[PDB]
Assembly symmetry: D2
């Protein structure tokens, strides 16, 4: 299967597959069952920002999600990603809906990777284009004329569809670690707008790092967030 | 045919096709016959650096090539690249040899492109830096004779196991991702590129040179573009 | 007297001292009488963005000012700033009012300077960004009437507690550290600057404008430089 | 007194004031007695590189020192620097000699600080100037025409002086934390050349963060590294 490291913004508690009983942010290391989670108050219709940070020295993957009123949730997990990820990867954003739904709109996304022994890759999207040639769109993900990336399906009356899954990966492979590097670090930021009129929103948005040839696993809508073939 | 904007470091004067009679740097807009050149002293076996700069406000494409002893050459050309380039491009490095030959070794390469707009840090950007190349450089598209090695360099043209450059060689490296080089709503579109290189020859004369280029995304080496055509153009027109 | 290079966003036409008869952006080299101007439509109460670009290879100082509806003005001037500026400078923002007045509110300001040389990433650089200013902005030198506030903005000229701008006001903000704007061994010296601004007036006419400037490190507001002199120059010469 | 957070490259073991018995890198939080150390093989006459990394999310101050042959030492310490440092600071490099000596030559220094809620400061010195107007030199520190920063005294026959102490601080104050920031991060890199013909080199080099008005404490040569008035 694919190899997956992901930071999940989990809006729907599936407390039978390891979720806590409450919306959360979690650090996923090769399993949808987060190694680490923190309670997250999602603010319906508000623009949130997620920051993800890691370096090979501290060996701590950290993430924080916040809203303009200052409320925020943070989670960190100690892990040496040299022993998890392949040397070359692709980086992306993933989202899904299931029986409940939400918009999974990305307003911006930036990523930086550095190997210092410097080699580096940095991209910033503050506005997306209709035909975004440096993005690989998988599943239901589209870019529009409003400058945003819709990861899951939306009807032309701006209503989110259910049972939807979509991804956006940066076109170029990324050299995420190299043995001779004294420092391998990466950081990513994205802003998002999750809006729902359901009685509960679902299922969430994730930033993920995968094998270069990663594709949406069969049957990964809903609680699997377009990342994992199963809940193991 | 491809669309090509390029900065050439031209080591061999082909005066029959518009070259000045002396090694030179030039700005190539859709033709190997540079719109603008400057005399260039290539220092055999020394590591040189080339810097390339452009922005949509000044609409002046500039380049300077320098060596550690301080000598440098510069060329600038006024051009609105919105009227030349496709909206999406690939960026790359190209080099060739012909009847004369040289190593066309790249030791490092960086590139930045930015689109800035109406408010600020409504910004799209792409930046990459290679200060060491790896054997399997997955974010580079190698064409023709170009290879990357475990010595950390990019050899654009063929070299023998004994380090000797070969003639009638052509090769290029393109960054893997397409680049959004202009966009109509942006107020500023800028790019900049730097590479360092080691051109060394024992021939009666070095040839043919190295170029930084920007092309349509599906650009490939034109057939027969060794020698004076630098792997960029199908003819000397 | 100070040495001043500036990009002016000039809201009030002082045709008696060389202004065109219409609001404009201009490039000021040691004089308030711009070497180059372009007609500029200031949009009262809208947030505008100014971008300023220069590098030592093209030796073209460029600037563009734009608003959210898409309208923009641009000006460029060919000049070798090595022959104008001291090796070390301070960079800043300046604004003034006179018989007419306007808010001269800065919402954000960024600046990058780079010296690149013989090999590569033998690079010296300075980069700062303010997207929010604080009450006690310790890395800014405020002169004249300039203040920073808890609304996150920099008010270059005086405003009343009821939000109303005042006349006969002048103020500036300089980044605290000196900047090494050129160095003889560098092959490339570049700088770039961006700021966003909100100019709003209820007067019969707004005046006088905002400038991005580069000065000697010990530059101070010239006496009597309110109004048409924009806090930059001691006279209209 | 001053407030000091520092990463020390400690070439001389003062095992009576807390040093381990062997050259080390350590994380100093308001005391020369490092909260955390790691054994460090200093390579006489070789150019080393030090990287220092921190962010307010993971709350882990990390540092790594390496040489071109790949040998390296790393240390990390969990600390929330919002509770240690004043909001505004100056950042600098410090070095000293005592009864034993070494050159304390800085070949380059870069620093980046960001507040994301972005405000940012970044400077890079890959070559120093004779009159470096954006550096505050304290004590014996000088910049030369060879492009380097000599933190401690050197005779005109390139021999390092003893009982020497000097510092270089960046001219502008740095806004190192702000309450509303979702992410406050900083990173610093410097390259250095420590060379000695003594029978033991001493005393070391540190990257430090201080109150804006920090100055060399009286009697901080030797084992105090120009940072602390005493060994408490
Ligand atoms: O542009 C990026 O993606 C990096 C900066 C993140 C960012 C840019 N603008 C913001 C407004 C609110 C919260 C976060 C941000
Ligand atoms: O230039 C800086 O200070 C940041 C990069 C650090 C760095 C630049 N060149 C190197 C060679 C060896 C080891 C580290 C480096
Ligand atoms: Ca869930
Ligand atoms: Ca030729
Ligand atoms: Ca005027
Ligand atoms: Ca010691
Ligand atoms: Cl399952
Ligand atoms: Cl031909
Ligand atoms: Cl006058
Ligand atoms: Cl003591
Ligand atoms: Mn979950
Ligand atoms: Mn030519
Ligand atoms: Mn004017
Ligand atoms: Mn110690």
């Amino acid at each position: 299967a694919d190899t997956i490291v992901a930071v999940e913004l989990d809006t729907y508690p599936n407390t039978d597959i390891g979720d806590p009983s409450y919306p959360h942010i979690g650090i996923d290391i090769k399993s949808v069952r987060s190694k680490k989670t923190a309670k997250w108050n999602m603010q319906n219709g508000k623009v949130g920002t997620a920051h993800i940070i890691y370096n090979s020295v501290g060996k701590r993957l950290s993430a924080v999600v916040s809203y303009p009123n200052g409320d925020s949730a943070t989670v960190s997990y100690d892990v040496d990603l040299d022993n998890v990820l392949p040397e070359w990867v692709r980086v992306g954003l993933s989202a899904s809906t299931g029986l409940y739904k939400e918009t999974n709109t990305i307003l911006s996304w930036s990523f930086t990777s550095k190997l210092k022994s410097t080699n580096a890759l940095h991209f910033v999207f503050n506005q997306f284009s209709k035909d975004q040639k440096d993005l690989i769109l998988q599943g239901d993900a589209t870019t529009g004329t409003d400058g945003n990336l819709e990861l899951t399906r939306v009807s032309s009356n701006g209503s989110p569809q259910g049972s939807s899954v979509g991804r956006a990966l940066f076109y170029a492979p990324v050299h995420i670690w190299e043995s001779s590097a004294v420092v391998a670090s990466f950081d990513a930021t994205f802003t998002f707008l999750i809006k729902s009129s359901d009685s509960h929103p679902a299922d969430g948005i994730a930033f993920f790092i995968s094998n270069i040839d990663s594709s949406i696993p069969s049957g990964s809508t809903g609680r699997l967030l377009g990342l994992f073939p199963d809940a193991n």
